[PDB]
Design a binder for this molecule. Structure first.
Ligand code: GTP
Ligand code: GTP
Ligand code: GDP
Ligand code: GDP
Ligand code: MG
Ligand code: MG
Lengths: 430, 140, 430, 430, 430
């Protein structure tokens, strides 16, 4: 009687949704056709006899990815008319997907959301995935969040956004729409998790020893993180954690809800079994700055609160004996007004392996969600990138001619300045 | 920062000033011992402990980590004291070029004294305003 | 006659009860199907204390299980001895509290509590002669620490003359699993002192310390901590269910261990406890039991009892033994430690003997002592509370559901006043 | 418990370790696949001294291998027992030092050493109780003699109370393979005296002399010299891994063999050593072992021990033997040679007995004596150094990487002062 | 109702404790498992049903010997948690075991001593064994004696110390810690017995005809001496002697309590039965200077008092007839102020034989404990050895850096000078 609905918008969102939906189907024993040859209820729904239907909706204005989905092996799984598709792409223009073509599509998506919500009885909250540096992704994510915040109100929404890397970039105009989308979801999303690609590339290179990774390898790690986060809702555990038990433990103030994640262990089968993978060493590896899932240095800032999930055969006393060691270290310092900052969850189900993938099978794993003061650097560098081109009003004509006003750029800049001032104000000791 | 070469008297004054500070490690060679930027962070932290998070500067033998420490110090600390070190001067310091660190220490000393005086004036002015406001509320 | 009903709330309380009832059933020879298969006549004479009688000759506990989420009770039913509980007594909500005290005490816990109070009233009105209630809950969680404490006040308002027990687990700063523990601990201690007739604090840190040092078992789990807590719980009411030389119900302990109505926070301990490999070496004698009973490491709390002076003490011996030896040993443990006993109340140790030992053991002792050393726990809890509250961290979650900061200030002031007036008698001299 | 980690640097150190670990594995019955196949129970009781435990039951040495060029470690991996080493511990650069001390200590060795120090810190922080470190390196090479000695200072700065061992091969003037040997030998001896707790000098010339005269084998190779050095290395820590009549760890030898903190340069030797054709003629008795142990040609250094007087001596007997015979023979070897023992410290020979002999031998002895005859090596090294330095030959290579002649002058002066103050006690009388 | 507790510290202490505890178990019929297949009460305690537990505690900082004990045939005998073991050895450094690592272990030992003492009702006194020429042995013995002298006060403590031989030595630094430990136990121990190894080696060689003895042969003789000393407490005898009846008979003055022992007969079964072993000849052999258990010449000094124990079928009149003969001889002269100097004890139980040992079975034996003025020679020679190295302050840095002050060496020298002056002052006639 506990449910959650995941929203996938944009090319990156759909490509990570595919990645998480192989993993969930594999973890619950459901074949790609949707047929089994009481834990499924969190992500799926029973049709009365036979197949299961995911509680997910796919959105995009550009039809190529959806058409690829509707012809692959998973054509029989998803309901045919929840893969909403458009005709014309926003083409990396934020104003297009927020004012011009997204408005005519958003009504169908909201109707689908209502039709899925009326089925659930214990709706925990929503999940949303969107790559920020694109037109349709950021614009439609903003519009959907704004509609949901007023249609439903206090229901919790979680956002797994992928911000651009510090120096590596695929587009040339992504700072503009990244800043605008951050403006939009700052006052509209309860949790936002950092996911830039460069850090995960470094993780793959160093640990998985892959020298030529593709997007699928990144999306599989993200899917594993999602599964670790939501395992506690569908498996028995000695110390459970619910989604609604987050803003009471990781969010000191309503404005501050951007945090960065990490995962451990990450290791290949060729050298995994030569070492014992004790809980102490994995919880040490999870706190290593080089294993952050976002390219930010935690040594440059304080910690505010750490929520970290275990799964497997871990015993609570071993967890406490390792939290003490971390509190001992002099290179990790917490904020003054937080004496204890750890929330611990323990689950029994070990992580599942996907055949043909990178990760091996292990009995212990740890996933941490940590809120730290050091996150302000990404905001500062994105702001610096934005200012350089906004000084000469470059690329603005592509946005003014799509219905957006001239002054809309300035207030996003002011909100980022306010956020940066707030992060500095919080981190000073009393 | 094209600062002139220091004379022997100015060098002796800088060394005596640095020896008056209780640093975490004994000094043997100032040019090498400051090349990682950690000792300059400690020197500034002694006078301005709220300005410098010394834990952000790890001891370093690699050029990459020395350059990270110096860039971080230059952007977060020195800029707030109203000066910045050039990239070329940072490159001279990390390579332990003679006189490079001593010139930076001289500039840092002068900028530190000025920064402390300006902080004192701000406190004295704020205390005057707070005292003046308390005298008006006593009459109300 | 003089029976009590069981009420438990939250996940921690449900897990404690899931072992407490197993221990009681094993003691009385009740199979997991509710059928008696015991050996001794005394096993059935006073079974009305905890068990009711239904048609078909089976027995059903008079326990009431409540939580704001259905998962824990849906899991405890599948465990051993899970079928004994009457399905009608299961009451649950569909939302949960998310470790937020305000949600579990003002908004959600207020509407649901009517249904559980209905069944509580049904159970109490029916029974032959009420002795009282015993409550198991945790102070580290939102729904538990809120709904349980509000239920305490509601029960006290309707049965002012009955006795009330509470076994409360307080969050230790060593093993912290939730970041918002100080808030709901401090809020709960405020209400708990006003209504509970007896309170018994239990700490996970002390349980881990005991398991690691005395039993010396490699991998402690929640099952061992629950088993120790269950043995301690059963030891208190043993003489009320079995004959003995000096019977002593709960009210008699209440008279003799509480000098002033606001000083009713005890810490307990169980003896003997020996490792598997050393269970053959030791010989069970009254001196051996009493030397381990007053041992500082044997207390179920991290509070150090030689950092203060005992106001009073109690011991509940089990098994057949001579009373002269018990009295002389109690005198000896009080003459050799005169510095740690308050001097203006002479003969401050109570003893009782029950002729029925635990199954598998020939002698056992349960220790309940009221000491001034308990101040240290409230001191550290208040220290963390005031470290976190001065910045108003995580305050918006509580203030968004009708609560204000004034109730936080009053709670802090009352808790500090309790801390001060509890130590006031430590320095008092005659 | 009281275990040590292995760190080796340079080509010579890597080749020494490649045989030391083979000898240790053969002693403990570990197959080249990491699987135990031993016969005796004692072979596993103290295996934690050198080997770690991983999943799957295999064992992995806690060795760290470092060099400035990848060739030697790429070659040692293909040798026997090369798979035991963890691939993560291999750290190397892409440039090399070219036998230039300045490059391996100031420019290139400084940047790389952070990575190897990271894994060194990982290994030391984890282990149960640290005993110390042992270092194998050569003073005749640039990268070794630079990076190893700088690593010595870095380790000493972080672990001032632990013990430190160094097995150092100094360049002899007889068999010279590098023209710039005096420079990096003199520079290294300067730093080595300040930080190493123990130092053991080994010379290739003495090894060739031993192989040609005692074993009488026709064609010596580096494998035989490495095998002798490995046997000598293993003999020192034997009683720390096996029971015995008088156990004596490394710290006990440090207490008893170093009179003053700057006199810690020992020369060693191993007995018995016999030719293949004469291994049947000889009978292994304590007199036969002790007569070969004090033999001048048996020392692992070309220094002639009857050109000076022993400050102290040590012997580590192996096998099961009577202690009375050992003590009387030690007394006899000290009464018949009173002229070669310093007179103001009586009873200057330490003995120890270990009941586990080497595999294949019934008795063995390891000799570690602190003698004043070692001055001759520093004398000739300084003589060559001052013969080459007066013309500033090859000085530009060192001075082009930030080094100056002042550090050469200070090193020469400190080395000469060491030479003088080491012989100061030779002429001292009571 | 008479008890005694034996303390074993250090490698030599544990190895002689093993030797005495085979002998006691054999003499009282107790199997190595601790099970019998009213005299045991002096050394053992009854557990209620079955096994017996020795009243002994084993101490060491170096774990090898204790681990050897806990795996041998006697693993089931000793209580598992009275074999206190450390992690790091003192390594022959006295300052380590008195100031650095012994302090953290001494508390557990004192707790064990209290737990053993509360069981005894008629505690006669303590026995302690420690080899003096070692770090942990001497240091921990000193610290334990100093703690016991104030915790218990007037209870008698007996020390069976093993001083180094005149010329034979195993370490090189043992005079320093021997002198310091003599300083410590001079004012803290009631009886000290001399036990140097060289004299016992000569005894074995001459009488037992063993040319290659080991430590076990020495320890068996020491165990026999201990058994002869304590036989009178647990067997019926015509003339009993208690431990408390010593300082009234052998100790003329509080400072003088160092005495040397002897035993007779010592003979092998191959030639024992060819001679009658009359009481006169055994009591003559016991007084032979070559049969002293410490390498000191009694012909060089006067006697002060002789306490000598018999056991077997000896008749008192034969004892008197032999004391008269000894008084007759001109080579043995007593001090002027002592007309009678003999205390005689007679016991009926003959000495027990250990299978596979050296000594044969005999019906008569004699053990003498004699206090003589000649003992000053060992102090003088140890002082001379100490002065040679203390003149140049050799090996002092190993002690100053472990927390000990510089002046602590001088006052031990002054106390030895005072003791030597006192021994000269007592031995002069009036
Ligand atoms: N991690 C991850 N990021 C992706 C992936 N695909 C695209 N991105 C990121 O998405 C950003 C651009 O947005 P896209 O998702 O590609 O395109 P869009 O969101 O649909 O917006 P449009 O361009 O209007 O179609 C790029 O900067 C990429 O970094 C992916 O498969 N994995
Ligand atoms: N009689 C006798 N003496 C022993 C025996 N073992 C060691 N010793 C003596 O003890 C002296 C050194 O002290 P040890 O007992 O060996 O070592 P320790 O007392 O534990 O001190 P540490 O070296 O710090 O471990 C040596 O000089 C030996 O003469 C033994 O088995 N029998
Ligand atoms: N003894 C014991 N303690 C538990 C168990 N499960 C959780 N806890 C403790 O309960 C605390 C969390 O309480 P919580 O589950 O949030 O209570 P709730 O909010 O009422 O559900 C943790 O700090 C744990 O130490 C258990 O099975 N046994
Ligand atoms: N025992 C032994 N010595 C070696 C071996 N290889 C080289 N050496 C010695 O090492 C010296 C050269 O050291 P080098 O290889 O330059 O050290 P690096 O600069 O650290 O690589 C020569 O004088 C050799 O005597 C070997 O396999 N065994
Ligand atoms: Mg697209
Ligand atoms: Mg020892």
């Amino acid at each position: 009687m506990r449910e959650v609905i995941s929203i996938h918008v944009g090319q990156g969102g759909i490509q990570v949704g595919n990645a998480c939906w192989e993993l969930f189907c594999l973890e619950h024993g459901i074949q790609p056709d949707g047929q089994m040859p009481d834990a499924f209820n969190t992500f799926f729904s029973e049709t009365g006899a036979g197949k299961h239907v995911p509680r997910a909706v796919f959105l995009d204005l550009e039809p190529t990815v959806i058409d690829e989905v509707r012809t692959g092996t998973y054509r029989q799984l998803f309901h045919p008319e929840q893969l909403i598709s458009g005709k014309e792409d926003a083409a990396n223009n934020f104003a297009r997907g927020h004012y011009t073509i997204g408005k005519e599509i958003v009504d169908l998506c909201l109707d689908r959301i209502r039709k899925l919500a009326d089925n659930c009885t214990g709706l925990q909250g929503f999940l949303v995935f969107n790559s920020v540096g694109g037109g349709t992704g950021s614009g439609l994510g903003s519009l959907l969040l704004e509609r949901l915040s007023v249609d439903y109100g206090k229901k919790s929404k979680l956002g797994f956004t992928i911000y651009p890397s510090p120096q590596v970039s695929t587009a040339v105009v992504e700072p503009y729409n990244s800043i605008l989308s951050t403006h939009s979801l700052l006052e509209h999303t309860d949790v936002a998790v950092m996911l830039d690609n460069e850090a995960i590339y470094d993780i793959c290179r160093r640990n998985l020893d892959i020298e030529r990774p593709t997007y699928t390898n990144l999306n599989r790690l993200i899917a594993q993180v999602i599964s670790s986060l939501t395992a506690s809702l569908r498996f028995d555990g000695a110390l459970n954690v619910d989604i609604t038990e987050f803003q009471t433990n990781l969010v000191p103030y309503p404005r501050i809800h951007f945090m960065l994640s990490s995962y451990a262990p990450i290791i290949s089968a060729e050298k995994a079994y030569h070492e014992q993978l004790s809980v102490a060493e994995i919880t040490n590896s999870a706190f290593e700055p080089a294993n952050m899932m976002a390219k930010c240095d935690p040594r440059h800032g304080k910690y505010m609160a750490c929520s970290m999930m275990y799964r497997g055969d871990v015993v609570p006393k071993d967890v406490n004996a390792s939290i003490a060691t971390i509190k001992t270290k002099r290179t990790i310092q917490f904020v003054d007004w937080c004496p204890t900052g750890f929330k611990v969850g323990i689950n029994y189900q070990p992580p599942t392996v996907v055949p043909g993938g990178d990760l091996a099978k292990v009995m212990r794993a740890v996933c941490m969600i940590s809120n730290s003061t050091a996150i302000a650097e990404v905001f500062s560098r994105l702001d610096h990138k934005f200012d350089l081109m906004y000084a000469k009003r470059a690329f603005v004509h592509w946005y003014v001619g799509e219905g957006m006003e001239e002054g809309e750029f300035s207030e996003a800049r002011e909100d980022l300045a306010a956020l940066e001032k707030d992060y500095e104000e919080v981190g000073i000791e009393t | 920062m094209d600062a002139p070469p220091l004379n022997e008297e100015e060098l002796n004054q800088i060394y005596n000033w640095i020896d008056g500070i209780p640093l975490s490690r004994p000094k043997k060679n100032i040019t090498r011992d400051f090349a990682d930027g950690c000792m300059l962070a400690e020197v500034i932290s002694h006078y301005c402990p709220k300005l410098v998070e010394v834990h952000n500067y790890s001891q370093a033998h690699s050029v990459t980590q020395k350059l990270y420490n110096w860039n971080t110090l230059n952007q977060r600390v020195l800029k707030k004291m109203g000066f910045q070190i050039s990239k070329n001067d940072i490159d001279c310091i990390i390579n332990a070029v003679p006189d490079a660190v001593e010139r930076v220490l001289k500039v840092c000393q002068i900028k530190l004294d000025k920064y402390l005086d300006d902080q004192k004036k701000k406190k004295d002015q704020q205390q005057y305003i707070e005292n003046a406001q308390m005298m008006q509320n006593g009459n109300k | 006659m003089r029976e009590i009903v069981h009420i438990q709330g939250g996940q921690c309380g449900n897990q404690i009860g899931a072992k407490f009832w197993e221990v009681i059933s094993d003691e009385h020879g009740i199979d997991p199907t509710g059928t008696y298969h015991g050996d001794s006549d005394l096993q059935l004479e006073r079974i009305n204390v905890y068990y009711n009688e239904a048609t078909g000759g089976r027995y059903v506990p008079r326990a009431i299980l409540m939580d704001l989420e259905p998962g824990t009770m849906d899991s405890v039913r599948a465990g051993p001895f899970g079928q004994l509980f009457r399905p009608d007594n299961f009451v649950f909500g569909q939302t949960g509290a998310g470790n937020n005290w305000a949600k579990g005490h003002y908004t959600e816990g207020a509407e649901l509590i009517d249904s559980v109070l209905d069944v509580v009233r049904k159970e109490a009105e029916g029974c032959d002669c009420l002795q009282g209630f015993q409550i198991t809950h945790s102070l580290g969680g939102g729904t538990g620490s809120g709904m349980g404490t509000l239920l305490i006040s509601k029960v006290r308002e309707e049965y002012p003359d009955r006795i009330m027990e509470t076994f409360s687990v307080v969050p230790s700063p060593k093993v912290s699993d939730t970041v918002v523990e100080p808030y709901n601990a401090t809020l709960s201690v405020h209400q708990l002192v006003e209504n509970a007739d007896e309170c018994m604090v239990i700490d996970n840190e002390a349980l881990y310390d005991i398991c690691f040092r005395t039993l010396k078992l490699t991998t402690p789990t929640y099952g061992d901590l629950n088993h120790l807590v269950s043995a301690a719980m059963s030891g208190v009411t043993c003489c009320l269910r079995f004959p003995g030389q000096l019977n002593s119900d709960l009210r008699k302990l209440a008279v003799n261990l509480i000098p002033f109505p606001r000083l009713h926070f005890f810490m307990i301990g169980f003896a003997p406890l020996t490792s598997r490999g050393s269970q053959q070496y030791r010989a069970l004698t009254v001196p051996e039991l009493t030397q381990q009973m007053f041992d500082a490491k044997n207390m179920m709390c991290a509070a150090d009892p030689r950092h203060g002076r005992y106001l009073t003490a109690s011991a509940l011996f089990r098994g057949r033994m001579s009373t002269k030896e018990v009295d002389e040993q109690m005198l000896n443990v009080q003459n050799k430690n005169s510095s740690y006993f308050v001097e203006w109340i002479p003969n401050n140790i109570k003893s009782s003997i029950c002729d029925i030992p635990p199954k598998g053991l020939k002698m056992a002792v349960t220790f309940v002592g009221n000491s001034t050393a308990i101040q240290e726990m409230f001191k550290r809890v208040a220290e963390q509370f005031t470290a976190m509250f001065r910045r108003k961290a995580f305050l918006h979650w509580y203030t968004g559901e009708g609560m204000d900061e004034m109730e936080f200030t009053e709670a802090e002031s009352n808790m500090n006043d309790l801390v001060s007036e509890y130590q006031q008698y430590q320095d008092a001299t005659a």
